[PDB]
Design an enzyme around this catalytic site. Structure first.
Site, mmCIF file in Angstrom:
data_model
loop_
_atom_site.group_PDB
_atom_site.id
_atom_site.type_symbol
_atom_site.label_atom_id
_atom_site.label_comp_id
_atom_site.label_asym_id
_atom_site.label_seq_id
_atom_site.Cartn_x
_atom_site.Cartn_y
_atom_site.Cartn_z
ATOM 1 N N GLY A 41 5.105 4.927 22.051
ATOM 2 C CA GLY A 41 4.511 6.089 22.682
ATOM 3 C C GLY A 41 3.564 5.759 23.808
ATOM 4 N N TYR A 42 2.423 6.438 23.817
ATOM 5 C CA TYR A 42 1.477 6.278 24.910
ATOM 6 C C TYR A 42 0.867 4.874 24.951
ATOM 7 C CZ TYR A 42 1.444 11.291 26.194
ATOM 8 O OH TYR A 42 1.769 12.563 26.648
ATOM 9 N N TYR A 225 -4.470 21.562 16.403
ATOM 10 C CA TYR A 225 -4.645 20.429 17.320
ATOM 11 C C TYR A 225 -5.929 20.424 18.144
ATOM 12 C CZ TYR A 225 -0.062 18.475 16.298
ATOM 13 O OH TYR A 225 1.047 17.933 15.682
ATOM 14 N N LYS A 234 -11.893 15.304 16.904
ATOM 15 C CA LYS A 234 -11.899 15.145 18.353
ATOM 16 C C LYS A 234 -13.302 15.327 18.933
ATOM 17 C CE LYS A 234 -7.564 14.274 18.697
ATOM 18 N NZ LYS A 234 -7.098 13.005 19.285
#
Length: 390
Positions: A41-42, A225, A234
């Site tokens: 992925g990233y 999210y 987050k």
């Protein structure tokens, strides 16, 4: 998907290498890069942008399963083997560590390699989205994150990816313990431990920077999210970034969260609403010329935020985050999503969204579905590369 195709994975990696090279190989960005979560992925894209876009030496940490002669390893194993093979061919330093990035042993092993093999310092530390289970150093207690809303049940239209049907899916709210534990896993605590260890060992270059990857996504998934238990984590991550930023700034560097776009990943594939939104937004963005995959995202992060040729500081949001979800979160893209969302049914799923694209990109993660691979040929699953097993 329970198997993987080694050559397919290699061709995936080669495609990303070609993509970053096509954007221009630069020599005035990072030189010595540590990527925590480097195999897929990233994280993988960041390693490829750094090495092949910017000619950097790289050390990657990940947890994957090696292949044996009779059983395929995980995709990230073959991705990393391909990376190593091609980075070495290109004359670059490329070393990897397979094990638990949350562990003190991983930090110690990284520090030893930086000191003994890399010239003594790193100038960029990439912290990919962490695994959802964290064994705490010292105590050994294991914490698990929860992708749940807070305060009420979350319900949204979704796809059953086993049946290619539209369903309604619900997620029950997090307990207080789940909120705390999600912060412990998906917050900034371990990222800070990494910077602490690297600083304490004297292996952070003057001007060293760090970036941790994040995600906010679309309004329909805000309760899980952006907000919810993950949202609290987050907040911790963003708070940690600003703390690390001040710390690294004293030595000429800095730190940021980079909020990235929605792309197909193994993790979100398990959450039924996400294949639906991703399929929808892929179709809309492709029509508008704004679609990007992992390598486009990382090339844009490196070239248009972190290491701008015009020498200017990266643009940031109100919380000092770098935003690569800027094109995705445009009103026109998001409004188009809002218009289609109520219309979707099993009967029109493939016609209203890029669900075919979603399915292709999902299989691609594991090395399948490419048009430049002979899938009839024999597969060698025992693939060795320059990788320390913790």
């Amino acid at each position: 998907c329970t198997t993987t195709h080694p050559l397919g994975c290699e061709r995936n990696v080669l495609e990303q290498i070609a993509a970053t090279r096509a954007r221009g190989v630069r020599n005035d960005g990072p030189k010595k890069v540590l990527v925590i979560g480097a195999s897929s992925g990233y994280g993988l894209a960041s390693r490829i942008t750094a090495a092949f876009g910017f000619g950097a030496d790289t050390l990657g940490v990940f947890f994957e399963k090696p292949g044996t002669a009779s059983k395929a390893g995980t995709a990230g194993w073959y991705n990393s083997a391909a990376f190593d093979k091609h980075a070495k061919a290109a004359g670059l330093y490329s070393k990897s560590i397979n094990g638990d990035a949350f562990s003190d042993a991983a930090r110690a092993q990284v520090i030893e390699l930086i000191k003994t093999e890399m010239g003594g310092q790193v100038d960029l530390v990439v912290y990919s989205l962490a695994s959802p289970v964290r064994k705490l150093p010292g105590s050994g207690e294991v914490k698990r994150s929860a992708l749940k809303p807070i305060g009420q049940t979350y319900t949204a239209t979704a796809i059953d990816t086993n049946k290619d049907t539209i369903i309604q899916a619900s997620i029950e709210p997090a307990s207080a313990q789940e909120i705390e534990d999600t912060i412990t896993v998906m917050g900034g605590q371990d990222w800070e431990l990494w910077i602490d260890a690297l600083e304490g060992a004297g292996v952070l270059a003057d001007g060293a920077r760090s970036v941790a990857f994040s995600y906010i996504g679309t309004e329909i998934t805000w309760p899980i999210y952006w907000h919810g238990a993950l949202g609290k984590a987050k907040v911790d991550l963003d708070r940690t970034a600003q703390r690390l930023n001040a710390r690294l700034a004293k030595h000429g560097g800095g730190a940021n969260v980079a909020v990235l776009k929605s792309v197909v990943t193994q993790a979100s594939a398990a959450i039924p609403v996400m294949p639906l939104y991703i399929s929808m937004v892929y179709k809309i963005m492709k029509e508008k010329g704004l679609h990007e995959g992992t390598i486009e995202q990382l090339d844009r992060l490196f070239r248009e935020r972190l290491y701008r040729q015009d020498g200017q500081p990266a643009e940031v949001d109100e919380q000092n985050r770098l935003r690569l979800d800027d094109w995705e979160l445009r009103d026109d893209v998001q409004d188009a999503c809002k218009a289609l969302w109520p219309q979707v049914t099993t009967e029109n799923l493939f016609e209203l969204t890029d669900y075919a694209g979603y399915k292709h990109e999902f299989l691609k993660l594991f090395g399948f579905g490419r048009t430049d691979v002979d899938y009839d040929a024999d597969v060698a699953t025992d693939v060795a590369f320059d990788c320390i097993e913790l």
